[PDB]
Amino acid sequence: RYRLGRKIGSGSFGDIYLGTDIAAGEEVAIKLECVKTKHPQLHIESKIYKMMQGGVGIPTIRWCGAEGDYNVMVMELLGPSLEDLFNFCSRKFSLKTVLLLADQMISRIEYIHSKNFIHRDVKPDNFLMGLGKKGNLVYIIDFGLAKKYRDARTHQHIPYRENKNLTGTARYASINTHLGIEQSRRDDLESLGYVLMYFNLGSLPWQGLKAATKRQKYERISEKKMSTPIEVLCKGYPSEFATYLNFCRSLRFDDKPDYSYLRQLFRNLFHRQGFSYDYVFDWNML
Ligand SMILES: COc1ccc(OC)c(-c2cc(C(=O)Nc3cc(-c4[nH]c(SC)nc4-c4ccc(F)cc4)ccn3)n(C)c2)c1
């Protein structure tokens, strides 16, 4: 029911291709997993997507299961990632674009959390713009590293644990993630904070650290991140970004974040600039 096209990259635990849904006469994206793999995960991830279905900015998928030597998941085709568009904009976003993105991304993460999961890999590569009439909508992708943090019925939080391996990207990981603490809601939001300052700066001060082993690289990133005060990181930019990061760093393991407070930070800032309020991102202005 699908024709496989060219390879376009890799997800957390599989390979990504373009394809043709011949029944629908539509192009789709296809994720493949070797059926004879040590730790199968595509089916689990598909179940997570299905629990998220219908939410704003949640892609629609179809778990087709096993064809030949591969488990197959099919997703509606989406547009470029925020990293692609960041490079298209020469690696700098205007304050307007950063704040519009911030408002969408805080709420996207809140939705995931409302469905009892934490994402644990918040980074620009995992946010894709929609196509056509939804070209202004930011979608989130990739639940291969997501984890349930509370019981669906009782809302009982999972237990506090330590000595956990880093799951996700080192550049945007929270400080407590580097220290091996079990991730929770606070960590997704802290990662988002680093993503936003990354959009503001073009790079983070813990980028481009040289090391031999990967472990050494991650340790150097961790140390630089813990030795860079938030006020230094955010120097020369509106205080709201530092307030955001400090607020995230003050949350306890099982605290429910005040998402509306953070959105309101950035919205008040947004409303003091004298922008035109047409909803246009930087990449659609050049
Ligand atoms: C027509 O609009 C544009 C404009 C520019 C573009 O590239 C700069 C593109 C464009 C967009 C893609 C693309 O890959 N779209 C896409 C990717 C995924 C995707 N990306 C990743 S990580 C690199 N995993 C998945 C994926 C996840 C689950 C699944 F079942 C299938 C794919 C999902 C849906 N659409 N490609 C190859 C080109 C489209």
Residue numbers in the entry: 8 to 293
According to the publication:
Protein kinase CK1δ is a member of the ubiquitously expressed and constitutively active Ser/Thr-specific CK1 (formerly known as casein kinase 1) family which comprises the six human isoforms α, γ1, γ2, γ3, δ, and ε, together with their closest relatives the tau tubulin kinases 1 and 2 (TTBK1/2) and vaccinia-related kinases 1-3 (VRK1–3). Pathophysiologically, identification of mutations within the coding region of CK1δ as well as deregulation of CK1δ expression and/or activity levels as important determinants in development and progression of severe human disorders such as Alzheimer’s disease (AD), amyotrophic lateral sclerosis (ALS), familial advanced sleep phase syndrome (FASPS), and cancer has dramatically increased interest in the development of potent and selective small molecule kinase inhibitors for both therapeutic approaches and basic research. The present follow-up study reports on the optimization of lead structures 1 and 2, respectively, leading to stable novel inhibitors of CK1δ/ε with IC50 values in the low nanomolar range.
In line with this notion, a ligand-protein structure of 16b could be co-crystallized with a C-terminally truncated CK1δ construct and the complex structure was determined at 2.0 Å resolution. In fact, crystallographic data largely confirmed the calculated binding pose of 16b within the active site of CK1δ. As determined by X-ray analysis the 4-fluorophenyl moiety deeply penetrates into HPI, enabled by rotation of gatekeeper Met82 towards Pro66. The bidentate hinge-binding 2-aminopyridine motif forms two hydrogen bonds towards Leu85. Furthermore, Lys38 and Asp149 coordinate a water molecule which donates another hydrogen bond accepted by an imidazole nitrogen of 16b. HRII, however, is addressed by bulky 4-(2,5-dimethoxyphenyl)-1-methyl-1H-pyrrole-2-carboxamide, probably displacing energetically unfavorable water molecules and shielding deeper hydrophobic cavities of the binding pocket. CK1δ, however, is addressed by conventional type I inhibition in a DFG-in conformation as confirmed by co-crystallization with 16b. And fourth, fixing the (E)-configuration of cinnamic amides 1 and 2 within five-membered heterocycles led to 4-(2,4-dimethoxyphenyl)-1-methyl-1H-pyrrole-2-carboxylic amide (16a, series 4). Especially 11b, 16a, and 16b exhibited excellent efficacy with IC50 values in the single-digit nanomolar range in standardized kinase assays and are therefore among the most potent CK1δ inhibitors reported to date.
